Amino acid sequence: SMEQVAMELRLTELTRLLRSVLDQLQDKDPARIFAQPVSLKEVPDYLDHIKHPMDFATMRKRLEAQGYKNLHEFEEDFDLIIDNCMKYNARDTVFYRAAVRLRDQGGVVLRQARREVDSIG
């Protein structure tokens, strides 16, 4: 149908805007602490602690399969990155501190993304 196409164009455009959001958030992680999944070879107990692991490469795979239907889904995954880190790692660690700084800096980007998603529809 023509409606299915129109819906698919909206999803494609949302994907465009989320790719740009993802790039901007990932620039706030210059140490690349959140770039890849926590290694289960190197942290073998990780899944005993963290039930839903997340990282920027995994988000990017979902993104490119147009797997985010709305900004809320995308933000859920970004929040998992931060929240998982802040639980697994102690306050006095470079990991925890990196997550705090990513959260704080990402907030700005996400605030305007929401306005853009609502504005353009």
From Swiss-Prot:
There is a cross-link at residue 41 (Glycyl lysine isopeptide (Lys-Gly) (interchain with G-Cter in SUMO2)). Highly expressed in testis. Residues 9-113 form the Bromo domain. It is found in: Nucleus; Chromosome. It comes from the Eukaryota. Component of some HBO1 complex composed of KAT7/HBO1, MEAF6, ING4 and BRD1/BRPF2. Component of the MOZ/MORF complex composed at least of ING5, KAT6A, KAT6B, MEAF6 and one of BRPF1, BRD1/BRPF2 and BRPF3. Interacts (via PHD-type zinc finger domain) with unmodified histone H3. Interacts (via PWWP domain) with dimethylated and trimethylated 'Lys-79' on histone H3. Scaffold subunit of various histone acetyltransferase (HAT) complexes, such as the MOZ/MORF and HBO1 complexes, that acts as a regulator of hematopoiesis. Plays a key role in HBO1 complex by directing KAT7/HBO1 specificity towards histone H3 'Lys-14' acetylation (H3K14ac), thereby promoting erythroid differentiation. This is Bromodomain-containing protein 1. The chain holds residues 555 to 674 of 1058 of the full protein.
